Ligand binder design. Structure first.
Ligand SMILES: [Mg+2]
Ligand SMILES: [Mg+2]
Ligand SMILES: [Zn+2]
Ligand SMILES: [Zn+2]
Ligand SMILES: [Zn+2]
Length: 143
RNA sequence: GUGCUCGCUUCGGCAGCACAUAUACUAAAAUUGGAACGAUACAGAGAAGAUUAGCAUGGCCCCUGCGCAAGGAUGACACGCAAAUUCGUGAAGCGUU
């Protein structure tokens, strides 16, 4: 039933209170995963996945660093069991990147010129506010 | 948006400085047009008397095949062929009478 777990050992003792939100988010990700490809779009059908991923990982980032309500061993375990995302967290550590939409939208190779996608640009630089949903994430102005 | 100014300065905002910087055939679309070796239906097989094995040449003809192999009715099509030429036409120049 759960994210059937490879480590075979006991999850530490702070795991049962992060359990319910984690699971419900997981069943949620399964529903957003199954939501089937109607006249929806093709480029826009992966956006919910990056929502829920960012959400999972922002949750565990709260329950470690912002509240200090989890042991670091349980933390690395929740990294290893796919509930968290190592590289999202590792960027979120940086200065300008608090609200990173996903890890790709800063991958410069995915664009022709080797620059980040406009998702990264602050809203002040535009000053015109034409609504932009970044192709990769679907995000609207992460930072 | 995060943070720091022994910032105005309370815990509000505002300020300032630091960091963070530019995706995209933008379309779920909308047109636009050839073909399917499918019926149909016609049509209907090289060489000399007859029945027939092929291997080629040629070129805006292709198909199956990894193929520089092999096959496809000898894969098909090649089917007027022109031409100079035996003697004259005339035309125009250069010299002779
Ligand atoms: Mg042959
Ligand atoms: Mg032939
Ligand atoms: Zn963004
Ligand atoms: Zn983006
Ligand atoms: Zn994004």
């Amino acid at each position: 039933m759960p994210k059937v777990k490879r480590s075979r050992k006991a999850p530490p003792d702070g795991w049962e209170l992060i359990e319910p939100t984690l699971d419900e988010l997981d069943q949620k990700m399964r529903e957003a995963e199954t939501e089937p490809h109607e006249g929806k779009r093709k480029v826009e059908s992966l956006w919910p996945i990056f929502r829920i991923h960012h959400q999972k990982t922002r949750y565990i980032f709260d329950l470690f660093y912002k509240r200090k309500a989890i042991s670091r061993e349980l933390y690395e375990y929740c990294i290893k069991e796919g509930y968290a995302d190592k590289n999202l967290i590792a960027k979120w550590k940086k200065q300008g990147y608090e609200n990173l939409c996903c890890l790709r939208c800063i991958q410069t190779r995915d664009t022709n010129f080797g620059t980040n996608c406009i998702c990264r640009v602050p809203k002040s630089k535009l000053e015109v506010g034409r609504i932009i949903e970044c192709t990769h994430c679907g995000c609207r102005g992460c930072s």
